[PDB]
Amino acid sequence: QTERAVQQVLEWGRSLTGFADEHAVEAVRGGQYILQRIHPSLRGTSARTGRDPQDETLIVTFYRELALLFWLDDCNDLGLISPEQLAAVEQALGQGVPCALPGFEGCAVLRASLATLAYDRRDYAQLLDDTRCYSAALRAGHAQAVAAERWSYAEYLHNGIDSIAYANVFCCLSLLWGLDMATLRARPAFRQVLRLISAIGRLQNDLHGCDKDRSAGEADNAVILLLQRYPAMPVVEFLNDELAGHTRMLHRVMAEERFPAPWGPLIEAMAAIRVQYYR
Amino acid sequence: QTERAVQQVLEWGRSLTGFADEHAVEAVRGGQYILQRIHPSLRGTSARTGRDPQDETLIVTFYRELALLFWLDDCNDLGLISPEQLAAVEQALGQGVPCALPGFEGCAVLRASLATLAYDRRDYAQLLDDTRCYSAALRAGHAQAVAAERWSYAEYLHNGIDSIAYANVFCCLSLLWGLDMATLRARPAFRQVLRLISAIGRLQNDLHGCDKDRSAGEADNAVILLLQRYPAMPVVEFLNDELAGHTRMLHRVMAEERFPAPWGPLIEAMAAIRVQYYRTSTSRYRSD
Secondary structure (H helix, E strand, O other): OHHHHHHHHHHHHOOOOOOOHHHHHHHHHHHHHHHHHHHHHHHHHHHHHOOOOOOHHHHHHHHHHHHHHHHHHHHHOOOOOOHHHHHHHHHHHHHOOOOOOOOOHHHHHHHHHHHHHOOOHHHHHHHHHHHHHHHHHHHHHHHHHOOOOOOOHHHHHHHHHHHOOHHHHHHHHHHHHOOOHHHHOOOHHHHHHHHHHHHHHHHHHHHHHHHHHHHHOOOOOHHHHHHHHOOOOOHHHHHHHHHHHHHHHHHHHHHHOOOOOOHHHHHHHHHHOOHHHOO | OHHHHHHHHHHHHOOOOOOOHHHHHHHHHHHHHHHHHHHHHHHHHHHHHOOOOOOHHHHHHHHHHHHHHHHHHHHHHHOOOOHHHHHHHHHHHHHOOOOOOOOOHHHHHHHHHHHHHOOOHHHHHHHHHHHHHHHHHHHHHHHHOOOOOOOOHHHHHHHHHHHOOHHHHHHHHHHHHOOOHHHHOOOHHHHHHHHHHHHHHHHHHHHHHHHHHHHHOOOOOHHHHHHHHOOOOOHHHHHHHHHHHHHHHHHHHHHHHOOOOOHHHHHHHHHHOOHHHOOOOOOOOOOO
């Protein structure tokens, strides 16, 4: 249930400097959206895993990991905290250890729960890996926005695929419900869909907030970056065609490959989730 | 001898309908360039693998795979053989079996040599999959050029990464010289640099042939695709920036990963190869 899930995310969230209520709220709303979409398929893996679709401890840990990702993003930008504080947080979340600086106890606590709940501990090691990748991409994008020289579209998109965090969302679901992502990752086509869906998410997100960012003066957005470098280029039309192109590619792969449940529906729910559905 | 290697690629090429002298000559020119650039490293790995950089059997098979790639590209673009023949050739090469139609016995000879010579057989299967991706990309780019809808820059580049065939080249080198590409592929960063170097080869080639194409009525090229879909866009400026961005990314990952020899030098040699160094030269003289 929504309001309750939210309260539980909010109470854990109190042990993190810079945590806002919308962190919990966006987390629950986006996490709800995904779970509802994969529920029918998830119920099919239960019998094998012993992990129930509606298990309250699993669901709330998932929402807390989502809020952590939203919070971390804000830390890097709204500047809720310092590069030192952020570096300590990064080490805690990326290695699974107590944070060496005060004010971020919720970090060791969430990671500890994830470690204990992991169906396949490999997924926990993977999640730490994905966490370091995601925070490094937040830091790189943030620094690039005020750097002496501008990134190419290729660099932005590549970084944007890591900072959209879909890899993290998938890892966390596999960890909790035993989705065997480690095995799927051995498949090139699975890796390609992971990048495709992340790029779709990065592009939908940027196209959605470009007007706001344009007025506000925000350069960590594909539309602004391209408009700054290529004033004459029809940037929005281009990015929209890019989004359409990645979506077509994802469709060809999906139609050609068959991924064990619930990956097919998980992939499609992420492909469809817009940023306006939870922000 | 350079000429003896050309003749051994040619003799084998005689068992491939549509094979031209130019396919052999450009293969040896491009293949020699690559082998020269990584020669000191291969001397280094030869102690552990038992595969000599000077072994003529390995060199000639490598050049024959390159000639195959040049021939296949021409078959797709100049209609050297029929659509029915190309499909049979592609099936034979993608599964590593004899061609079902006659006139292509070289497909069987080459695939069987690769199978026999493979240091790590996982590279042989990889080479078959790369061959399949390669021929499919060549066809897809040809088809999209008269298709109803133009694809996005993103589709073009994904296809273009398969059509430049760097993956095939690397795999063939690992196959013959025991370079462990199948093991290194377990590293995400290794797979990332493979995609970067291919994209770099594709952007470099396209920024070079856009005036050749535009002239001949060829829309299968990034500069042409983008100018057609976005006439006001500074396409050449954008693509050069993309190329420089992919290069900066490649340099950063290579510097972090410290891949084992000869991979750094191999990636660098491909970054530097100019079509100028192998294609351009050969073309059978005609009195005019």
